[PDB]
């Protein structure tokens, strides 16, 4: 165990040992983006794939081209922390090496006066953060992975509502990664048709004729050919024994006189023996049998030169007689039946109106472009650019791999463009399935479904940006001069930057980071959605894709998915699953070598699983190799059944591979229903961090894995001994083992303190380590918002008693004690941003000074020196933050107002109050203020004094980093100096700056001091570089929107506490609303007198079918059962060895488990520090499936002197009488999630109205009105209500004259409507009149 783990040992109730540990949870995001910025030569991945595809751009219109060499990145403008403050997009400038090539017409390729440019600006691409996110405009955003159909070839059946009877069809679909769609389908008339780019139906032979295939060549490729012969006037045929089987012959089948099958005789199997043995090659056939058959080749008269019969034509009695007249020897036909061979291609040729290649190319052009008449040059150009051009059509690396995989090919490698042989092979396989021999692939199969992450989706958006540029490049090459207009001026950076920015913060799969909790931060990054571009919409593909497919097993989580309209489209990625080399989903497996099981780990794709027999993790193993039982529950090729030991090829790694991270933290998932585990995983993501995070008593073991991988918690890069601890800075001295020669061994860990999130929650990094503690790599140094010591801590746990109350737990409702409010356990910190923008108008520019003509000095007491409110001022809903004034002009005073001005004296000329005020409600206090100014600067005194604070703090932040790094550098120098020449007392007296000149005799240690002296000068050099850059950013004139002078943003930290209305939920789906905060007096208590914290309804368990919350309650009191006995000790102070025996007994319960905690060999200092952490209960881990047993919890309950049943007798606080039945009391992990009652409560009587329609609208001061829909109208129509709906339609809605006249009646005390014409119908009347249709109102 590590030192960070030794302070808090979690008792694991697992049985199966961990073979493969949990990997990096955000590996999908980081590894994929590094492919985009990868400098890979030939390995086409990311940017290098995008540039080399288009470039070198050539133009033979003016004989000139532009070439590509390599690209540059690095040098970011602002840091990840600096981007969030001043609102800058975190991106690195892309500069590409480009050179213009000039050709002269004399030699094949003659270059004259070549000009090369080093760096050309091509916009800037957003870089991924240290965790796995992008900072766009200031806010942190995530790119969601896309789930789509894999490029290659698909085969679909579709046998639903078709034709009339229900004829089963077969469809072949060639889908590329970039290009046009190829569809081959059969129609109700049995014929085959081709669809180009999913449009009109063309005959299947039209695509072959365009590929230069004659009518003779089309029939040659697919069909078997029967050869008829003309010998001595009579007609004969070449015989094949396989052709005549089952079908009754109407003629006498004879060979050289001998008759085998005569008129009115059937052929079975006996006759296919007599003809084979007698060496029969030629038989006599009548004129009737040949007539009706389809010819294959053209046969002309060799004496005249005229066409008798062309390819694909019906034969008759007269046509066969002319063939003997001409003098022909051979006739070639086709062999087509009704079962295994059919004339699908043959019958389409007659339907096909085209004659040659040119005719076919025009028909394709007319389908794609039905407007302009085509020429031969235009028709040939379009077809070659469809599926044969490299710049237009591409299968990519994965497409050709899967394309050759289904068609059964030798090679997996190939070109992106489809060849002429590839198109025929897809057509050949489609006929095979129609005949019989052929299988239909599944669309829902994960072996046919790919994952488009971040780097792959950004590559396609960058490629189309280059397509937008290449049009302007090649056209201007022949347009102008090639002597002056050379390098940079040719390519513009505007089209590139616009295409990239509309993807990172505008696309459907690019949303805000759901940073409610570290779990929601991780799960959102590994979300897989099938709603991206080139995928599926909300109302498409039916419900088949939404359903769980057996391939999901250990790749996609079956339970964790949105329960809304998406259900199935958006899915969570499982723990151990990763992306392979071709984008397919794969899950690790234990390799079994026919007997013994080895720790060999193999990642297998969805296609690979349908071959091997996979054993379940539920089975027990003998020793560590082979199985115990002969009959083992296994799964193979989709289905799952029992198998022998020798047939087993693979096994599951762990019993956690099927469930994703979001639902992995759920304690007793086995005892929960799949419907409520679906909901319970979603409730954990909405959880809001409490003021003080507390460890979960009933955990799983993944709590520690979530905290580290989230990136919100500060982890040690190297480790060693902690030198100085602060609530902002944690510095560490390296253990010298991982310290490499060159620089000082001190790492600075700067902590983010109180920062605003996307969901307005607080982000805080509290220190954990004490001064003088040894830690290593991977050790947790600081905790985030919802994390405890090393582990995840979502929303704390309270005392839970399942008992009915006096109607305060009617339906899902949950009670709370006053102690929950008194002790800050559910107090949530919310940081809010409020912006004040001074704007330039046509009347006059706006000012932001403390000169309010209306209020003063009452609200101006909070506001300080002419501008904004002071830092750290407690303000309530109504106080003024930024004093904004706006010029209005005119201000015509009414006769009555003119008198009022003369009586008292009033000053309100042009100056109108429009100041930034606190939203109407209850708010906290001001934390920080920021003022952004125009490019003309014109600094305000308040804006100038804060920049003085920004400069001095940044000076100290950079100076303190140098001081510590210098201290550790010269301390390392002393270690080198002492070793060899002992001067422990001599060097201390000498000044430390004169240590650089001193050194040992020129050896290997002299080279060691060479790097130390170089780094000292390097640290002093980079300090000046960082300070110059820091001074520039503060004094920099902030660029903003036009018509804006100054933007002031005042941040407020609201400390809102828990109250009735807030949404509380468990981990198993048990959600509820808080009824009433009851005092500690009336709430139930134990025999010893311990009051219960929260009371939850017991009725919402058997119908809900979630037993996981009950077993969490039983183990909850059991967890504190050990903790209370540790709490009973130490206070009285018992012996350390006496305390040591009880703790050792606690970690070893139930005879045999798995987790072996060190047998009391911890040091006296470590045991006492551990017992302090275990004082408030014992952390118990229960795995996802192989967790704590039902009998094991009862055994742990007896350790802490508690009943095995879990039910204890309680006393009522109000009466004092006993509850006539024992109630189950324990500890369940409760969650105070998002969308609280403070944000949900809205109320309006009167306010602002919209412009186009005169109905209520919300924006400032008062909230928006509630919509009265047509479903609510039916209710009032069903009731005898008439005057209430009259109110809803006129005075409460659109009627202009109605609302104001009615409002005055309320104040006067009249309560009368007096309704008129609503503006909803008044606009409608003018809209019909403007069309040209007379509509008028007629009287009585």
């Amino acid at each position: 165990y590590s030192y960070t783990e030794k302070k808090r040992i979690r008792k694991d109730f697992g049985k199966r040992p961990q073979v493969l540990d949990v990997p990096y949870l955000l590996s999908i995001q980081l590894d994929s983006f590094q492919k985009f910025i990868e400098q890979d030569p030939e390995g086409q991945y990311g940017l290098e794939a995008a540039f080399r595809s288009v470039f070198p751009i050539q133009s033979y219109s003016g004989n000139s081209e532009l070439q590509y060499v390599s690209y540059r990145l690095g040098e970011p403008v602002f840091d990840v922390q600096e981007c969030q403050i001043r609102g800058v997009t975190y991106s690195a400038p892309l500069r590409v090496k480009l050179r213009l090539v000039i050709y002269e017409r004399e030699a094949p390729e003659g270059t004259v006066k070549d000009i090369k440019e080093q760096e050309v600006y091509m916009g800037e691409i957003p870089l991924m953060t240290d965790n796995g996110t992008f900072v766009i405009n200031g806010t942190e955003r995530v790119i969601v992975s896309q789930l789509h159909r894999s490029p290659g070839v698909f085969f679909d059946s579709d046998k639903g509502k078709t034709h009339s009877s229900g004829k089963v069809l077969y469809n072949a679909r060639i889908i590329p990664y970039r290009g046009s769609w190829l569809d081959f389908e059969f129609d109700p008339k049995d014929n085959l048709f081709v669809r180009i780019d999913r449009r009109r139906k063309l005959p299947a032979t039209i695509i072959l004729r365009a590929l230069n295939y004659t009518t003779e060549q089309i029939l040659d490729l697919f069909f078997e050919k029967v050869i008829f012969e003309i010998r001595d006037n009579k007609l004969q045929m070449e015989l094949v024994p396989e052709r005549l089987r089952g079908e009754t012959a109407s003629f006498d089948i004879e060979a050289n006189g001998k008759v085998y099958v005569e008129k009115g005789r059937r052929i079975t199997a006996r006759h296919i023996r007599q003809l084979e043995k007698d060496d029969v090659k030629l038989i006599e056939v009548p004129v009737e049998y040949i007539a009706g058959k389809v010819v294959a080749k053209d046969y002309i008269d060799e004496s005249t030169g005229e066409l008798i019969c062309a390819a694909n034509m019906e034969l008759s009695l007269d046509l066969l007689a002319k063939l003997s007249q001409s003098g022909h020897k051979r006739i070639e036909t086709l062999f087509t039946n009704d079962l295994d061979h059919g004339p699908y291609i043959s019958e389409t040729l007659r339907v096909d109106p085209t004659n040659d290649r040119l005719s076919a190319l025009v028909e394709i052009y007319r389908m794609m472009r039905p407007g302009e008449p085509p020429t031969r040059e235009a028709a040939e150009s379009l077809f070659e650019n469809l599926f044969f051009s490299e710049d237009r059509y591409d299968l990519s690396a994965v497409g050709r791999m899967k394309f050759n995989r289904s068609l059964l090919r030798e090679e997996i490698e190939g070109s992106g463009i489809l060849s002429k042989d590839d198109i025929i092979d897809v057509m050949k396989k489609l006929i095979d399935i129609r005949n019989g021999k052929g299988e239909v692939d599944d669309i829902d199969h994960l072996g046919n479904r790919r994952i488009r992450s971040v780097g792959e989706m950004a590559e396609n958006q960058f490629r189309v940006g280059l397509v937008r540029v290449e049009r302007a490049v090649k056209e201007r090459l022949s347009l102008g001069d090639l002597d002056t207009l050379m390098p940079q001026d040719m390519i513009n950076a505007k089209p590139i930057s616009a295409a990239v920015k509309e993807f990172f913060g505008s696309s459907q799969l690019s949303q805000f980071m759901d940073q409610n909790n570290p779990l929601s931060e991780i799960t959102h990054k590994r979300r897989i959605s099938a709603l991206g571009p080139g995928g599926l919409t909300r109302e498409r593909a039916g419900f088949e894709v939404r359903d769980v497919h057996p391939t999901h097993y250990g790749r996609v989580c079956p339970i964790e998915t949105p329960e809304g309209p998406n259900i199935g489209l958006i899915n969570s990625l499982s723990v151990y699953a990763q992306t392979n080399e071709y984008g397919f989903l794969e899950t690790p497996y234990r390799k079994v070598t026919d007997g013994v099981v080895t720790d060999e780990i193999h990642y297998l794709s969805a296609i690979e699983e349908g071959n091997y027999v996979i054993a379940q993790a539920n089975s027990n193993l003998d020793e560590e190799g082979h199985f115990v039982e002969d009959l083992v529950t296994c799964r193979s090729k989709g289905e799952s059944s029992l198998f022998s030991r020798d047939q087993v090829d693979y096994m599951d790694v762990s019993t956690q591979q099927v469930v994703s991270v979001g639902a992995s933290l759920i304690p007793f998932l086995e005892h929960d229903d799949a419907n409520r585990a679906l909901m319970g995983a979603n409730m954990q993501r909405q959880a809001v961090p409490t003021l003080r995070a507390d460890k979960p008593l009933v955990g799983t073991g993944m709590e520690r894995a979530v905290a580290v991988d989230s990136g919100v918690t500060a982890v040690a890069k190297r480790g060693g001994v902690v030198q100085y601890v602060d609530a902002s800075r944690i510095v560490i001295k390296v253990n010298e083992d991982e310290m490499y020669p060159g620089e000082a061994g001190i790492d600075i860990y700067n902590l983010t303190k109180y920062t605003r999130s996307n969901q307005n929650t607080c982000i805080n990094q509290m220190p954990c380590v004490s001064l003088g503690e040894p830690v290593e790599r991977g050790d947790v140094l600081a905790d985030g918002p919802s994390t405890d010591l090393g582990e995840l801590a979502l929303g704390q746990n309270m005392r839970v008693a399942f008992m009915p109350w006096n109607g305060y737990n009617f339906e899902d409702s949950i009670l709370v004690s006053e102690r929950v409010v008194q002790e800050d356990r559910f107090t949530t910190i919310h940081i809010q941003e409020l912006a004040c923008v001074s704007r330039d108008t046509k009347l006059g520019p706006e000012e932001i000074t403390a000169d309010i003509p209306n209020v003063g000095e009452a609200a101006l007491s909070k506001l300080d020196e002419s501008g904004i409110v002071y830092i750290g001022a407690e303000v309530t809903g109504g106080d003024i933050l930024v004093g904004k004034v706006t010029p209005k002009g005119e201000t015509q005073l009414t006769p009555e107002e003119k008198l009022l001005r003369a009586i008292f004296g009033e000053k309100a000329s042009d100056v109108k109050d429009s100041s930034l005020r606190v939203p109407n409600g209850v708010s906290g206090t001001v934390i920080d203020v920021q003022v952004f100014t125009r490019d003309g600067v014109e600094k305000d005194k308040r804006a100038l004094e804060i920049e003085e604070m920004q400069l001095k703090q940044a000076k100290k932040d950079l100076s303190e980093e140098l001081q510590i790094l210098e201290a550790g550098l010269f301390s390392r120098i002393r270690a080198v100096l002492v070793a060899g020449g002992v001067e422990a007392e001599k060097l201390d007296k000498l000044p430390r700056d004169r240590w650089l000149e001193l050194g040992l005799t020129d050896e290997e240690k002299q080279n060691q001091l060479e790097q130390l002296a170089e780094q000292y000068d390097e640290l002093k050099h980079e300090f000046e570089k960082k300070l110059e850059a820091k001074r520039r950013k503060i004094t920099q004139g902030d660029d903003l929107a036009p018509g804006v002078l100054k933007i002031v943003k005042v941040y407020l930290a609201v400390k809102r506490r828990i109250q009735p209305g807030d949404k509380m939920a468990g981990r198993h789906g048990n959600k509820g609303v808080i009824s009433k905060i009851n005092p500690i007096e009336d709430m139930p208590y134990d025999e010893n007198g311990t009051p219960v914290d929260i009371v939850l309804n017991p009725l919402g368990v058997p119908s809900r079918m979630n037993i996981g919350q009950i077993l969490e309650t039983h183990l909850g009191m059991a967890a504190k059962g050990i903790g209370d006995k540790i709490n009973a000790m130490l206070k009285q102070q018992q012996e350390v060895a006496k305390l040591r025996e009880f703790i050792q007994r606690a970690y070893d319960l139930g005879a045999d488990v798995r987790q072996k905690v060190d047998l009391s060999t911890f040091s006296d200092e470590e045991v006492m520090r551990l017992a302090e952490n275990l004082r408030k209960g014992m952390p118990i881990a229960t795995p996802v499936f192989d967790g704590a047993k039902e009998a094991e919890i009862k055994e742990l309950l007896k350790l802490g002197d508690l009943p095995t049943s879990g039910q204890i007798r309680l006393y009522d606080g109000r009466t004092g009488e006993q509850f006539e039945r024992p109630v189950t009391v324990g500890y369940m992990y409760m969650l105070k999630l998002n969308h609280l009652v403070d944000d949900k409560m809205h109320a309006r009587s009167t306010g602002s109205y919209s412009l186009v329609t005169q109905q209520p609208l919300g924006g400032k001061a008062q909230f928006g009105g509630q919509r009265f829909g047509e479903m609510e109208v039916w209710a009032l129509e069903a009731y005898g209500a008439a005057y209430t709906l009259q109110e809803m339609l006129t005075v409460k809605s659109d009627d202009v004259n109605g609302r104001t006249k009615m409002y005055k009646n309320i104040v006067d005390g009249n309560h009368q409507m007096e309704p008129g014409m609503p503006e909803s119908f008044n606009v409608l009347l003018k809209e019909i009149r403007s069309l040209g249709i007379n509509i008028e109102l007629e009287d009585e």
Partner: protein, 57 residues
């Protein structure tokens, strides 16, 4: 007025214009759109006062 509420609007408005139709406002859905009292419940006794005076006047 009642038809164009849920049916196709352009077909109804063209049919009403050619034929020269008159909507006397008797249906419940007809009076909700124009902003008048419903010929049902409380407004039913109100509606009978105007329908009776169409024959005489």
């Amino acid at each position: 007025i009642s038809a164009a509420s849920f049916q196709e609007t352009t077909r109804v408005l063209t049919e009403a214009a050619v034929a020269g139709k008159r909507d006397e406002l008797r249906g419940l859905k007809e009076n909700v759109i124009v902003g008048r009292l419903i010929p049902a419940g409380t407004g039913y006794a109100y509606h009978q006062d105007r329908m009776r005076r169409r024959a005489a006047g």
